[PDB]
């Protein structure tokens with residue numbers, strides 16, 4: 001991979017692997033989400049920021065501040081087949097004192113056509129206290145020279161799906177998968193549960209008949225609280241809708257504390 | 270990747286990814302095992318065999334016959350760091366009517382030094398009845414032109430670790446991780462649990478303090494029975510000693526054995 005000519009975005013090519021595909025012989029949404037994280041990490045390395053997933057400056061490291069994903073929104077038109085080459089372009093942009101945004105465009109390497117797009121909202125948080133804080137001018141200025149100055153949005157549309165408010169699923173859920181636990185393969189280098197694991201956990205409560213007759217088109221996922229390595233999770237889903245839509249809730253198995261909420265949109269194969 | 274000059278082995282380079290590393294900022298043994306699978310699959314594609322993990326011929330497909338892993342043995346000297354390039358060379362060899370063997374050598378691309386090696390034993394099985402069968406001459410001959418004729422072993426030493434008999438762990442286990450279940454990410458394209466998931470499940474019962482102060486050097490794992498998508502697994506471990514452990518994976522209900530293995534760990 002490499003930064004583009006103007007140095008304000010990063011591109012990288014990936015060949016889809018045999019273990020990265022599902023029952024359709026095409027890449028799963030979790031393989032896609034891992035590739036988004038990989039290209040995000042290589043973009044941070046290219047410009048001197050931390051490579052641990054929190055993309056910090058030396059100023060943020062001294063204050064124990066990190067960037068944390070608040071929302072992930074992914075829209076796939078065609079999942080790359082095994083052996084296909086996918087090219088992903090990524091960039092970041094400040095959104096005032098609220099937080100920052102990382103966007104991605106996925107393309108078929110052979111045809112040059114757009115096969116997907118994603119956006120994510122990030123907030124700044126103290127690593128130890130877990131307290132959120134509005135971005136300061138001095139931290140903001142450190143990032144502005146690595147971002148486009150004019151707005152560049154993967155989801156420019158008027159009332160786009162990426163910014164819609166997600167409601168809380170009310171019991172009883174129509175479907176559930178109970179007692180989900182992370183294993184060591186689900187942890188990152190800092191022993192935190194990888195953000196992509198939560199996507200997998202959300203999808204566990206979708207009936208197999210939906211997965212077998214439909215394809216996932218859109219997933220929007222809010223991240224409210226972290227699942228610890230020793231926590232147990234319950235994944236809940238209810239149909240809200242040719243296209244099928246679902247409302248999702250991930251909560252801790254004991255007290256029912258919310259860790260994530262989301263929506264998925266599926267189209268008939 | 271590509272077949273080598275003589276066409277009897279296959280090589281491929283991989284750049285270690287950010288999500289592929291553990292707490293040491295180096296590739297996990299599960300990332301290594303997935304890369305062994307990937308290069309095995311690209312080798313099969315390069316010579317016209319099936320790419321579903323069973324590396325079948327048209328003769329085997331007609332008979333509903335598949336190749337299934339019976340044993341995996343992996344020895345790592347240095348785990349590749351994040352961003353490093355690792356080159357893996359793989360080849361196959363027939364072992365008479367018993368089954369076949371796939372071997373691998375891992376190397377650091379920059380230095381050319383060997384950083385690891387692996388071997389695996391495969392048996393032929395009817396995919397529907399699950400009955401094992403000794404290889405026939407007609408199926409064996411189809412593969413012989415894609416394999417070295419003289420023996421080529423990743424583990425040459427007479428009576429080496431890769432061929433040692435593994436005993437059955439007796440209750441009570443010293444450590445355990447119970448109620449392990451596969452999710453969709455653990456399945457392959459044919460909706461079967463990926464062989465690498467079982468390695469992860471074995472390692473779940475190793476205490477965190479061992480993982481934090483030691484590095485995994487050798488893992489030998491026997492595959493006895495398949496975990497179905499709706500099965501629940503218990504992972505059991507007992508110290509037998511460098512630290513050595515005996516492992517057992519069994520179905521949560523009746524205690525039916527799915528795998529047994531050993532691991533050897535070195536102090537960091």
Ligand SMILES: Cc1nc(-c2cccc(N)c2)cs1
Pocket residue numbers: 043044045047049055067092093094100101143144146147
């Ligand atoms: C690798 C890069 N990260 C960024 C980035 C990271 C956090 C916040 C903002 N505003 C930008 C720009 S280029």
Ligand SMILES: Cc1nc(-c2cccc(N)c2)cs1
Pocket residue numbers: 312313314316318324336360361362363369370412413415416
């Ligand atoms: C891709 C390849 N598979 C083989 C292979 C596969 C099964 C049995 C034997 N004896 C060889 C050689 S090259």
